[PDB]
Design a binder for these strands. Structure first.
Lengths: 129, 149, 141, 61, 73
RNA sequence: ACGGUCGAACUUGACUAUCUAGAGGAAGUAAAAGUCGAGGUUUCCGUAGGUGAACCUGCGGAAGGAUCAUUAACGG
RNA sequence: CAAGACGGACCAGAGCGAAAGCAUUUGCCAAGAAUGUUUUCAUUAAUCAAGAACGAAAGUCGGAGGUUCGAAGACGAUACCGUCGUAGUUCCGACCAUAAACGAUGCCGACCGGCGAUGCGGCGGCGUUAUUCCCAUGACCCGCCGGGCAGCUUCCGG
RNA sequence: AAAGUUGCUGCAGUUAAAAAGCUCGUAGUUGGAUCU
RNA sequence: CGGGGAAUCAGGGUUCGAUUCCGGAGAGGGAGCCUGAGAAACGGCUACCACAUCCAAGGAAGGCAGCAGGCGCGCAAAUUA
């Protein structure tokens, strides 16, 4: 059955970006998916997206830009300190200049640099470059 | 993906976006409530009540009209069965399969389908015992099955 | 696939235990039935009393007659076959001399030409074969 | 007993022939099992003692 | 609740295995002294116990508070 | 000195386990050249039988075995 | 005339079943997938240790029947082949639980090219047929949707 | 340590070693969307 | 014997820790005591078991897993200063 809707959203975005598409439809929508997409969006990766509101769980249409190489989810949500973050960074990111490990912390869903800025650890969610 | 079958189909109902009651339906919520009451006093399940109301009375969705679904309406007035509809129908099917097995000994297909049906019965009974619908001592037995029907 | 859940540590640890038990190096080291069969008993060297001298025929591609010593170990009474290099050195071993024997080099595996031998003679009469081959010492009788 | 069955065969005579056949099969299977066990014993003894022959007593001097 | 003035409770915790960075469910059974002042106490509710001197061979804690089950009226 | 208690140990049986001296039994190799008189090539799987093995055969299964030609209708 | 056997051709890129498997007519029994659904419940689900049900053929216990075929076996020729033929092959009730039991290829879910064939269900439509059938319905024709069995094509990627 | 030949990071299971004959099934593992 | 710890070390790990620090246990094997604040003490005592010393044959005495040292065992380890 469908477990981890964010895994499906990221897999569909990655598969559509590999095919060179300009728009992708992901269903169902959720809060975590919209937060993750906003985290990509403020860094200039997925342009801007529509949320289609049925009375069920929603749908999202994302306008791809070609800038994404890979977006990925980490399952299960491991617990990340502020001292294990470097080890995660070297494991998951291609270089020290770009790419994004995404955490969920008590200050919201955000990336690793702003997590280090806010002095909070959290749970791992993804990475995109 | 069916739970006890290898098939998997898409046959279901697609509710519309508009939750509003259409203007051509002149029935009120209360009138639908006594329609439900008189359809339940003759011995109908809530699903049969909803089908009859949809096909002839124009009640597309009773919970959009009245505000409550049929089982809660019947439970408010006390016209609800002591065991729910789907468990009752699974028990009745199990009783029919057991009777056929008693009359026909060499039907191993019937034995297989009976095991599947009673596994469904135990899963649904476990769910209902969790949600305090059934008593915590409720138990489905082979020999005392038809007494529940 | 393999279980990935956050509470799956017991299954991962149990499976890695039971699958470690399939690597024959691990099972050789930990089962203990390979040290109860080892004539050296987990030791690097062992001393023994020479029973006889034997001529071990080499394998099929190399036609020769290598020459070894059949020696009974002092510490446990097990009889083994040790390799003395040459007739240069074989004539330094007489019957009933006390020889210090090592493994041959492949950690319990056989010589590349002669079969059934895993050991080589290092010392005879408490003096080395290298100092006798090179004439640096003589052995007492 | 290689006797072809007759078309006018009666009761208590067919049953005796069938019982004889099943009993014959029974001790035939029993002595086949005994022969197999004896051959297994001989094979294991030969394997162990040939391994002994390759262990020691092999050489010229 | 099968003993005289003594009950058996079960504490469930989640032990951390650090090679795999994972967890495993563990439990500990615990014999505690149930005072007769706690009437209408039944299997499945949450007891808060405090440590005292050894009361028996296996009893070292004593029931202080009882909170009913998640659905029990 | 009676009694109690802790209790090393001793003796007798059964269960075992080890070390030892062992008649005898059944054996491999070195020496005895003393004695008498094969065959399969389609390949397998599961069973059962044939002198034990091999191999053959019975029943069921597989290809992991080398697809040419005729053929839409054309009678209502 | 009788006895038991077995259901050819139709019979397929077909269908059904959890698999093993399933083909003469009619009647009875209870299941079932897919479809259709502006029905009902509201997370009741996915996977399997333990455990349980079925499981080709051969084989084993007991009853019945032995048509054909036929292990072993008896003859004749040259392991091959022929004649005869026991157990078995058949039915009933218990054991056995093994196959190249195959897609040599876990199960559930998502995404990722195209085409048109086919089985079933639903929908829309010119039209032809039940000797220009006097409206509907079955049989065809075109197109669409859903779940299927199964092909061809592709520098998707591997 | 080489050994990503014990693999959590991080291996494999058509043809090379390898997926249970099939289904049900407790324990365990995992579990849709929704509340400033 | 456990731990502090040691080797290796991209990251994760794998292996080791008899051994000078801390804690435990034992003084050939068990058991029971006396004294004392503190021992079930063994460079204290009393038995039994296994060893072993001296003897005028009646008796007496013992415990190096302390420091040296010896024998044995072994592939394997120092001076009776």
């Amino acid at each position: 059955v469908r477990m981890n809707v964010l895994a499906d959203a990221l897999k569909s975005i990655n598969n559509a970006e590999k095919r060179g598409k300009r728009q992708v439809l992901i269903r169902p929508c959720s809060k975590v998916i919209v937060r993750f997409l906003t985290v990509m969006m403020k860094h200039g990766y997925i342009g801007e997206f529509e949320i289609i509101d049925d009375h069920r769980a929603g749908k999202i249409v994302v306008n791809l830009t070609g800038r994404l190489n890979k977006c990925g989810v980490i399952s299960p949500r491991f617990d990340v300190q502020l001292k294990d973050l470097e080890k995660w960074q070297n494991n998951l990111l291609p270089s020290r200049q770009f790419g994004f490990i995404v955490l969920t912390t008590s200050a919201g869903i955000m990336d690793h640099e702003e997590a280090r800025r806010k002095h909070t650890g959290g749970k791992i969610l993804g990475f995109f470059f | 993906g069916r739970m006890h079958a290898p098939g998997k189909g898409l046959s279901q109902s697609a509710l519309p976006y508009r939750r509003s009651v259409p203007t051509w339906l002149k029935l009120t919520s209360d009138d639908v409530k006594e329609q439900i009451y008189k359809l339940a006093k003759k011995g109908l399940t809530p699903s049969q009540i909803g089908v009859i109301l949809r096909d002839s009375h124009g009640v597309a969705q009773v919970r959009f009209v009245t505000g409550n679904k049929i089982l809660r309406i019947l439970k408010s007035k006390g016209l609800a069965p002591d065991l729910p509809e789907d468990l009752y129908h699974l028990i009745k099917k199990a009783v029919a399969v057991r009777k056929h097995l008693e009359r026909n000994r060499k039907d191993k297909d019937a034995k297989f389908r009976l095991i599947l049906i009673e596994s469904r019965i135990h899963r649904l009974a476990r769910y209902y015992k969790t949600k305090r619908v059934l008593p915590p001592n409720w138990k489905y037995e082979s020999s005392t099955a038809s007494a529940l029907v | 696939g393999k279980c990935r859940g956050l509470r799956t540590a017991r299954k991962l640890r149990s499976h890695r235990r039971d699958q470690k038990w399939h690597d024959k190096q691990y099972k050789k080291a930990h089962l203990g039935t390979a040290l109860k069969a080892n004539p050296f008993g987990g030791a690097s060297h062992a001393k023994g009393i020479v029973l006889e001298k034997v001529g071990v025929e080499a394998k099929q591609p190399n036609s020769a007659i290598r020459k070894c010593v059949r020696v009974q170990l002092i510490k446990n009474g097990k009889k083994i076959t040790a390799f003395v290099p040459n007739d240069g050195c074989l004539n330094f071993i007489e019957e009933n001399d006390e020889v210090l024997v090592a493994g041959f080099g492949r950690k319990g595996h056989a010589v590349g030409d002669i079969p059934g031998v895993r050991f080589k003679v290092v010392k005879v009469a408490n003096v080395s074969l290298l100092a006798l081959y090179k004439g640096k010492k003589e052995r007492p009788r | 007993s290689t006797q072809p069955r007759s078309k006018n065969e009666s009761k208590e005579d067919k049953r005796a022939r069938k019982q004889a056949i099943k009993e014959e099969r029974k001790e035939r299977r029993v002595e086949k099992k005994a022969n197999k066990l004896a051959f297994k014993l001989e094979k294991r003894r030969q394997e162990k003692e040939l391994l002994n022959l390759k262990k020691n007593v092999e050489g010229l001097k | 609740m099968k003993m005289q003035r003594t009950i058996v409770i079960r504490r469930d915790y989640l032990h951390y295995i650090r090679k795999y960075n994972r967890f495993e469910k563990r439990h500990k059974n615990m014999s505690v002294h149930l005072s007769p002042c706690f009437r209408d106490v039944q299997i499945g509710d949450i007891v808060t116990v405090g440590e005292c001197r050894p009361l028996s061979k296996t009893v070292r804690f004593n029931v202080l508070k009882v909170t009913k089950a998640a659905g029990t009226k």
